[PDB]
Design an enzyme around this catalytic site. Structure first.
Site, mmCIF file in Angstrom:
data_model
loop_
_atom_site.group_PDB
_atom_site.id
_atom_site.type_symbol
_atom_site.label_atom_id
_atom_site.label_comp_id
_atom_site.label_asym_id
_atom_site.label_seq_id
_atom_site.Cartn_x
_atom_site.Cartn_y
_atom_site.Cartn_z
ATOM 1 N N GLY A 1 0.833 -1.196 0.000
ATOM 2 C CA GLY A 1 0.000 0.000 0.000
ATOM 3 C C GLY A 1 0.871 1.251 0.000
ATOM 4 N N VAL A 2 0.261 2.428 0.121
ATOM 5 C CA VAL A 2 1.038 3.670 0.191
ATOM 6 C C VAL A 2 0.931 4.351 1.550
ATOM 7 C CG1 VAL A 2 1.209 4.362 -2.231
ATOM 8 C CG2 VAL A 2 -0.904 4.816 -0.942
ATOM 9 N N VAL B 1 4.329 4.023 6.503
ATOM 10 C CA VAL B 1 4.749 2.679 6.876
ATOM 11 C C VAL B 1 5.305 1.932 5.667
ATOM 12 C CG1 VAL B 1 4.091 0.543 8.000
ATOM 13 C CG2 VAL B 1 2.926 2.677 8.605
ATOM 14 N N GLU C 1 -0.383 -2.631 -6.714
ATOM 15 C CA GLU C 1 -1.292 -1.693 -7.352
ATOM 16 C C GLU C 1 -0.589 -0.442 -7.823
ATOM 17 O OE2 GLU C 1 -5.299 -1.916 -4.919
ATOM 18 N N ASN D 1 -10.572 6.633 3.313
ATOM 19 C CA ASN D 1 -10.380 6.546 1.867
ATOM 20 C C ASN D 1 -11.286 5.513 1.206
ATOM 21 O OD1 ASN D 1 -8.367 8.564 2.123
ATOM 22 N ND2 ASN D 1 -6.871 6.981 2.666
ATOM 23 N N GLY E 1 -7.749 -1.952 -2.922
ATOM 24 C CA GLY E 1 -7.406 -3.314 -3.281
ATOM 25 C C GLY E 1 -6.918 -4.154 -2.125
ATOM 26 N N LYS F 1 -3.723 9.602 16.658
ATOM 27 C CA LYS F 1 -4.105 10.876 17.263
ATOM 28 C C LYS F 1 -3.312 11.193 18.535
ATOM 29 C CE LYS F 1 -7.130 11.708 14.055
ATOM 30 N NZ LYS F 1 -6.836 12.754 13.036
HETATM 31 S S1 COA Z 1 -3.437 -1.004 -3.290
HETATM 32 C C1 COA Z 1 -4.139 -2.051 -2.025
HETATM 33 C C2 COA Z 1 -4.295 -1.422 -0.651
HETATM 34 N N1 COA Z 1 -5.308 -0.365 -0.491
HETATM 35 C C3 COA Z 1 -5.660 0.105 0.826
HETATM 36 O O1 COA Z 1 -5.189 -0.417 1.819
HETATM 37 C C4 COA Z 1 -6.695 1.210 0.942
HETATM 38 C C5 COA Z 1 -7.086 1.518 2.368
HETATM 39 N N2 COA Z 1 -5.993 1.834 3.269
HETATM 40 C C6 COA Z 1 -5.775 3.224 3.603
HETATM 41 O O2 COA Z 1 -6.593 4.086 3.221
HETATM 42 C C7 COA Z 1 -4.598 3.562 4.505
HETATM 43 O O3 COA Z 1 -3.682 2.496 4.463
HETATM 44 C C8 COA Z 1 -4.963 3.818 5.962
HETATM 45 C C9 COA Z 1 -5.734 2.601 6.520
HETATM 46 C C10 COA Z 1 -5.812 5.069 6.051
HETATM 47 C C11 COA Z 1 -3.631 4.053 6.725
HETATM 48 O O4 COA Z 1 -2.785 4.935 6.107
HETATM 49 P P1 COA Z 1 -1.292 5.116 6.568
HETATM 50 O O5 COA Z 1 -0.524 3.839 6.358
HETATM 51 O O6 COA Z 1 -0.695 6.262 5.767
HETATM 52 O O7 COA Z 1 -1.246 5.393 8.124
HETATM 53 P P2 COA Z 1 -1.278 6.761 8.937
HETATM 54 O O8 COA Z 1 -0.797 6.382 10.335
HETATM 55 O O9 COA Z 1 -0.387 7.824 8.325
HETATM 56 O O10 COA Z 1 -2.778 7.288 9.050
HETATM 57 C C12 COA Z 1 -3.442 8.050 8.047
HETATM 58 C C13 COA Z 1 -4.687 8.700 8.497
HETATM 59 O O11 COA Z 1 -5.541 7.757 9.106
HETATM 60 C C14 COA Z 1 -5.801 8.172 10.408
HETATM 61 N N3 COA Z 1 -5.913 7.040 11.276
HETATM 62 C C15 COA Z 1 -5.147 5.944 11.244
HETATM 63 N N4 COA Z 1 -5.566 5.107 12.206
HETATM 64 C C16 COA Z 1 -6.607 5.673 12.856
HETATM 65 C C17 COA Z 1 -7.425 5.290 13.927
HETATM 66 N N5 COA Z 1 -7.211 4.017 14.574
HETATM 67 N N6 COA Z 1 -8.409 6.102 14.340
HETATM 68 C C18 COA Z 1 -8.604 7.283 13.745
HETATM 69 N N7 COA Z 1 -7.829 7.683 12.725
HETATM 70 C C19 COA Z 1 -6.836 6.910 12.253
HETATM 71 C C20 COA Z 1 -4.630 9.034 10.757
HETATM 72 O O12 COA Z 1 -4.988 9.951 11.731
HETATM 73 C C21 COA Z 1 -4.382 9.691 9.529
HETATM 74 O O13 COA Z 1 -5.353 10.708 9.371
HETATM 75 P P3 COA Z 1 -4.948 12.223 9.000
HETATM 76 O O14 COA Z 1 -6.105 13.146 9.352
HETATM 77 O O15 COA Z 1 -4.687 12.296 7.515
HETATM 78 O O16 COA Z 1 -3.701 12.627 9.767
#
Ligand code: COA
Ligand code: COA
Ligand code: CL
Ligand code: CL
Ligand code: CL
Ligand code: CL
Lengths: 513, 504
Positions: free
Chosen positions: B268-269, B272, B293, B383, B387, B407
C-alpha cells in the site's frame, strides 16, 4: 468383488483398534470428510475409546484434527465425547464438537475451505503425522479411490508421515471414476499452476488419490454409513424465499443480465436450498449447471430430469432416500457428476472465471448488509465460514438467503450491527427473506439500508430498525455508515438478558412514540 | 512533438467547456485516474463551474462518477465543491469529496478495486454515458496511450456511449510503451478467459487503449499536473515496524518458508510502506519483484539500485522528487515497470498463483485480528477498501501494519472490537506495530488475542485490552470468540464523548 486390487497392500490390513494405535498424543491428523460424507469411521471410534481410557487414568491423549469440512458422529462426535481434540479446523457441524469449541475445550479456526490445503502445505497447522482417508477401493497400481467426497484428501496424503486407509464396502464400487484429482500445483509452493478449468463439466486429472505405498501403515476394512441427514422439507418460509429468488432470476433473464441457462450455481443444504432447487427444477430455465461444494437431493433430481446437465462439487450431501437412489443408479449419475478436490471446487480463480451465482445462508445481516455466517451474539460458533467466502467474493452474483427472524421470532435476522462479520458489504449484492428481496447493486451503505429494511426485515422489527437508522443519521460520528455505538449491539445484549430482541413496553423505546 | 498523431482525429479537438456540455444531469461518467495519477483535469473543472451556475438557477446537475481509484483536486475536488456528484465509486482521497461523503451529500460505495470493471460491465452502476480519459498521445492508428495510470480506462472506453479524451502535454511522452493492455476477457461476460500471466514481469498485451473513433465526441488539449505523494520520511514508529517485518522475512527465509528473493510484493502507500520499502532497498533480499497496485518512491529506488528487478502495478504515486527522477531516466525505468489494467493487477486468480506477499495499512484491528481499513468509529469514511481485500484474501501471506496508536496516543489501533470490518480474521495472518509483530498462523481466536495484545498493543492500552479479554472469557455468551457486548464498542464511544480512549 475384492476392493484392494493391489496385492502387496493387502499385507497392511489390520483391525481398526490396531490402526488407531498409530495415532499418538499430540499428533496432527488430516482426514477425509466433507458435509457428512466420506470421513473415516471405525478408526476414530477405536481412537476415542482408547482416549477415554487414557484420560480416566490421568493420561493426556488429544489430537489436532484437520478435515475437508464437516464429518459425522463417528469422527467429530466420538472424539468430542472423549474430549480428544485440542485443535480442530476448518469446519464442523457435530453438536458435541460444537460444545467443546464453545467451551474453549477445543481450539478452532474456520479457514476458508478452498484455502485449507494451501495453508496446510505452508505449515500453518504444523507437521502432519497421520492422514486417515476413507476409500472405495485401491487400484492395481496402488491408487486410492475416494468415497463420497474428495475434500483435502490428496493434500493430507502428500503431507502426512504415515497413512491409514479405511476401505468401506458400504460405499458403491461405481464411485470409481466419479472423482477428478489433479496432480497440478493448486495449493503448493508458488508459483502455482494455472488451474485450467473453463467449463463446469471439465476433467483435468484422474480417478485416484496418489500416495507412496511405503507411507501406508495400515488399511482397515470397514462397512458403515455416511451421515445422511434427513431431508429438510421446505416450509412456507423457505418456499417464499425461493419464490422471490426465482422471480429475480426470471427478471434478470428477461433483462438479458443472465442467459436462460443462468450461470453455474452454488447452493447449500437444508430447507431453503431445497426450496430453491425445487423451484429451479420447475422454472423457466434450461441447461443448468452446478459448480458448488456439494451435491444435494434436488440436484440429483435435476440431473435426472435433464434440467441440470452436470454438477461439480467436492462432496455429496444426500438424505437417506437420495443416497439409496444414487446407489441404485450410480452408472447414470456418475456420468453427470464430477467430484473435485475442495481447493479446486472452491478456487476463486475458477469461480470468478465461470461466473458462479452464489447462494448462501446467514445468521444475520446488519442494515448495511454486512453478513454474519458463524458467531451467534458475536461469540458462540455455529458451524464455520465454510466456503461461503470463497464463493461470495468470487461470484458473479452473491446472494444471501434467510428467514427474517430466528428462534421463533425472538431474534431479528436483520440487526443494527452484525455481532460478527464474515462477509463485508462488498461481498453481498442480493438479500432474500420471506418478506422480500433487496437488490443492492450499485448502492451506498445508506441506500443498502433503505432496501434491506424495506424489503427484507420482518414487520415486528422494521420500525425498530428504521428508528435506529433515523437516529443514527442524525447523531452518528460520520454519516457515511451511520451508527449509534451506544446501542449498536444492544439488541444482542437484550437477547442475552431477556431471551428476545423485542423490547418491553415497560421501558421507553424510541419507535413506540 | 505532436501528440495527436492520427490526423483525422485532430478535427475533434475542442474546448473543455464545450466538451463538458456533452455531460448531462444524471449521466454515469467513467474516468481515468488511480492514486492521484492520470485522471482528467480540465473537463471536470469546466463541468464543475457549469454545475454551480445551474444549481444557482435552480437546475439539477449531478453525475455518477466511477473511476479507477483516487483522483485529485481538479476532479474529485472541483466536483465536490460544486455539489455535482450524486454517486461515487470506488475510491477517493480528496478532502472535499470525503466531506460530501461523510455528510451524506454524495453516495459512495468502495468496491474491491479489481472487481469494479466487472461490476461496470454487469451494469451495477447503470449505463455509461461518458468515458472521460486522459491520454499521453493518440497514435497514428487511433490508439489511446494512457498516462500515469491504466486503472479501469479500457473498460470505460468499451462501455461508454460517448468518449472524451484529454490529451495532456504535461505527461511525459516516454510513458508510451510502459502500459500493457490485454485484449482478452478479464471482466466481461462469463465464461471469462484465462489470463496467461505466470510471472510478474510478463507482458501479455499492447501499449494502447482501444476505442472506436466514431465514439470519440471530443478531444481536449490540456496541460496540468497530477497529484504527488509527500516527500516526508519514515519516522521512528515506521522504522520500527519495518525492522520487525524485515526480521520476520529473514526468519521465514531461514526456515525455508520463503525463497531468498521472497515472493512478489504488494505494498500500500504511506509512511509505513515507505519505511518497509526503504528497509528493503538496503535489505538482504535480492532480485525482488513487485506485483502491486502502485509504483511508489521506494520501488523506484529499488529498481534503481537493482534490489528489485521489476515492478508491476496499475499506477504511479510519486513524490515530486521521485517524479523528477523518473522523468529524467524514463528509458531506464520504463524497462523495469509494467502498468496493467487494475482488473489484472488486482485479479485474485493471478495474485494467488504468483503467491504475493500483501502488506497493507489499517485504521485498527480488534484483539481477534479483524481489520478496519476504512471507517473511523464505524461510520466516518477515510479513503476506502481499495485493493486491500483483493490482495489480503488472495495472498500467500497477508500482513497488516500500523502504529499502535493514533491521534497522539488518544486512540488505540488495537481495540476490543473493530467498529467496522473490512478484513475478517481469515484474511489477516501477521500484524506489525512499533511494539512488535504478531504471527497468527494456525491460531484460534483466543490464541490470536493473546498474540495481538501482547505483541502489538501499546503499553498504555495493553492492560485495558487484557482486562476486557479476561472478563469476556468469564462472562461472554460463548467462549469461542469472547466478547462483552455492553463494552465492545465503548472505547470508540469514549473517544466520541471525551476525545480520548484513555479513561479519566
Ligand atoms: S493497493 C491495495 C491497498 N489499499 C488500501 O489499503 C486502501 C485503504 N488503506 C488506507 O486508506 C490507509 O492504508 C490507511 C488505513 C488510512 C492508513 O494509512 P497510513 O498507512 O498512511 O497510516 P497513517 O498512520 O499515516 O494514518 C493516516 C490517516 O488515518 C488516520 N488514522 C489511522 N488510524 C486511525 C485510527 N485508529 N483512528 C482514527 N484515525 C486513524 C490518521 O490519523 C491519519 O489521518 P490524518 O487526518 O490524515 O492525519
Ligand atoms: C448460517 C447458517 C448456520 C444457516 O443455516 P440454515 O440451515 O441455512 O438456516 P437455519 O435457519 O436452520 O439456521 C441454523 C441454525 O442457526 C440458528 N440461527 C440462524 N440464524 C440465527 C440468528 N440470527 N440468531 C441466532 N441463531 C440463528 C438457527 O436457530 C439454527 O440453530 P439450531 O440448529 O439450533 O436450530 C448456515 O448457512 C452455515 O453454517 N453457513 C456457513 C457455511 C456456508 O455457508 N458454506 C457455503 C456453501 S454451502
Ligand atoms: Cl488459475
Ligand atoms: Cl456494486
Ligand atoms: Cl486467470
Ligand atoms: Cl491459518
Amino acid at each position: 468383488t475384492e476392493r484392494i486390487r493391489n496385492v502387496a497392500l493387502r499385507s497392511k490390513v489390520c483391525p481398526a483398534e490396531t490402526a488407531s494405535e498409530l495415532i499418538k498424543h499430540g499428533d496432527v491428523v488430516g482426514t477425509s470428510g466433507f458435509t457428512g460424507a466420506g470421513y473415516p469411521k471405525e478408526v476414530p471410534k477405536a481412537l476415542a475409546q482408547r482416549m477415554e481410557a487414557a484420560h480416566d487414568r490421568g493420561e493426556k491423549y488429544q489430537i489436532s484434527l484437520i478435515t475437508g469440512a464437516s464429518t459425522g458422529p463417528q469422527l467429530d462426535g466420538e472424539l468430542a465425547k472423549a474430549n480428544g481434540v485440542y485443535f480442530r479446523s476448518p469446519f464442523n457441524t457435530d453438536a458435541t464438537m460444537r460444545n467443546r469449541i464453545n467451551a474453549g475445550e477445543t481450539e478452532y479456526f474456520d479457514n476458508h475451505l478452498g484455502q485449507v490445503a494451501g495453508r496446510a502445505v505452508q505449515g500453518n497447522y504444523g507437521k502432519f503425522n497421520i492422514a486417515l482417508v476413507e476409500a472405495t477401493a485401491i487400484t492395481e497400481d496402488g491408487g486410492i479411490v475416494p468415497t463420497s467426497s474428495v475434500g483435502n484428501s490428496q493434500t493430507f496424503l502428500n503431507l502426512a508421515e504415515k497413512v491409514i486407509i479405511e476401505v468401506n464396502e458400504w460405499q458403491n464400487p461405481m464411485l470409481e471414476g466419479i472423482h477428478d484429482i489433479w496432480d497440478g500445483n493448486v495449493s503448493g509452493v508458488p508459483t502455482r499452476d494455472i488451474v485450467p478449468i473453463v467449463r463446469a463439466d471439465q476433467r483435468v486429472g484422474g480417478p485416484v488419490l496418489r500416495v507412496n505405498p511405503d507411507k501406508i501403515a495400515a488399511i482397515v476394512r470397514t462397512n458403515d454409513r455416511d451421515e445422511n441427514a434427513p431431508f429438510a422439507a421446505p416450509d412456507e418460509t423457505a418456499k417464499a424465499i425461493a419464490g422471490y429468488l426465482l422471480d429475480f432470476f426470471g427478471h434478470e433473464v428477461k433483462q438479458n443480465r443472465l442467459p436462460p441457462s443462468l450461470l453455474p450455481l452454488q447452493s447449500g443444504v437444508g430447507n431453503v436450498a431445497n426450496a430453491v432447487l425445487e423451484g429451479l427444477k420447475e422454472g423457466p430455465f434450461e441447461n443448468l449447471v452446478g459448480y458448488s461444494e456439494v451435491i444435494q437431493d434436488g440436484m440429483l433430481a435435476m440431473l435426472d430430469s435433464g434440467r441440470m446437465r452436470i454438477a461439480s462439487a467436492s462432496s455429496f450431501s444426500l438424505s437417506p432416500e437420495a443416497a439409496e437412489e444414487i446407489n441404485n443408479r450410480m452408472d447414470f449419475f456418475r456420468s453427470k457428476i464430477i467430484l473435485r478436490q475442495q481447493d479446486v471446487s472452491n478456487s476463486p480463480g475458477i469461480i470468478r472465471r465461470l461466473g458462479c451465482i452464489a447462494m448462501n445462508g446467514m445468521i444475520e445481516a446488519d442494515i448495511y448488509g454486512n453478513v454474519n455466517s458463524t458467531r451467534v451474539m458475536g461469540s458462540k460458533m455455529m458451524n464455520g465460514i465454510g466456503g461461503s467466502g470463497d464463493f461470495a467474493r468470487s461470484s458473479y452474483l452473491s446472494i444471501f438467503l434467510s428467514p427474517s427472524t430466528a428462534k421463533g421470532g425472538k431474534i431479528s435476522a436483520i440487526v443494527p450491527m452484525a455481532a460478527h462479520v464474515d462477509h463485508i458489504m462488498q461481498d453481498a449484492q442480493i438479500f432474500v427473506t420471506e418478506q422480500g428481496l433487496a437488490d443492492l447493486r450499485g448502492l451506498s451503505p445508506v441506500q443498502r439500508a433503505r432496501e434491506i429494511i424495506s424489503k427484507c426485515a420482518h414487520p415486528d422489527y422494521r420500525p425498530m430498525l428504521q428508528d435506529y437508522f433515523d437516529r443514527a443519521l442524525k447523531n452518528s460520528f460520520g454519516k457515511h455508515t451511520p451508527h449509534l455505538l451506544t446501542e449498536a449491539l444492544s439488541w444482542h445484549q437484550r437477547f442475552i438478558d431477556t431471551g428476545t430482541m423485542l423490547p418491553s413496553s415497560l421501558e421507553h423505546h424510541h419507535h413506540h412514540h
